[PDB]
Amino acid sequence: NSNICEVCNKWGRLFCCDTCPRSFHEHCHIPSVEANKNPWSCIFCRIKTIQERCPESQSGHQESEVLMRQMLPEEQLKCEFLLLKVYCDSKSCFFASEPYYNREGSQGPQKPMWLNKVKTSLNEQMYTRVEGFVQDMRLIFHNHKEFYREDKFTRLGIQVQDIFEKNFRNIFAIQETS
Numbered sequence: 001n002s003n004i005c006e007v008c009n010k011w012g013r014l015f016c017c018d019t020c021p022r023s024f025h026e027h028c029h030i031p032s033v034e035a036n037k038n039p040w041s042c043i044f045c046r047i048k049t050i051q052e053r054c055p056e057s058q059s060g061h062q063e064s065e066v067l068m069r070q071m072l073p074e075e076q077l078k079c080e081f082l083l084l085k086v087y088c089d090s091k092s093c094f095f096a097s098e099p100y101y102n103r104e105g106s107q108g109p110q111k112p113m114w115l116n117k118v119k120t121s122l123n124e125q126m127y128t129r130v131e132g133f134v135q136d137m138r139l140i141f142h143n144h145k146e147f148y149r150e151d152k153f154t155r156l157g158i159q160v161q162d163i164f165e166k167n168f169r170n171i172f173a174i175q176e177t178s
């Protein structure tokens with residue numbers, strides 16, 4: 001197994017996957033690493049099994065059809081994995097916890113949103129369709145863009161949104177376009 005957390009890249013109290021060499025902090029894995037379960041398989045492993053069981057699940061899909069999907073167990077898992085892929089970027093720190101807004105010339109967003117709130121919402125099964133989760137994720141970056149205006153700090157929202165969007169297209173096998 002690796003000697004660092006796959007998500008945050010630090011050592012510590014790590015739980016090792018039984019089917020691949022990754023390790024995790026307890027609350028870095030999504031969902032949080034399960035109490036018992038020997039062998040234990042990480043989210044990466046569980047996603048790869050889905051693909052192996054249904055190779056046609058990798059054929060291209062339309063984003064509009066993906067969004068309307070109900071959050072059955074396989075879609076729940078895919079959204080957890082996509083959330084986890086965002087936390088894997090170190091720049092996710094800026095978007096993890098509850099923000100506050102007091103900048104000359106700007107007003108805070110009407111609907112603040114942050115990664116740990118999305119994580120809670122997934123854990124609590126509050127999204128009934130893929131669209132719910134994707135809307136809250138894109139709201140994070142849109143609020144950041146609007147608040148920071150011409151400050152160069154706006155670029156951190158562009159960067160982390162690009163990681164979200166590339167991983168969304170991969171995980172949900174969105175049809176490639178020009």
Ligand SMILES: [Zn+2]
Nearest residue numbers: 005008025028
């Ligand atoms: Zn970690």
Ligand SMILES: [Zn+2]
Nearest residue numbers: 017020042045
């Ligand atoms: Zn694994």
Ligand SMILES: [Zn+2]
Nearest residue numbers: 053054055056
């Ligand atoms: Zn199949």
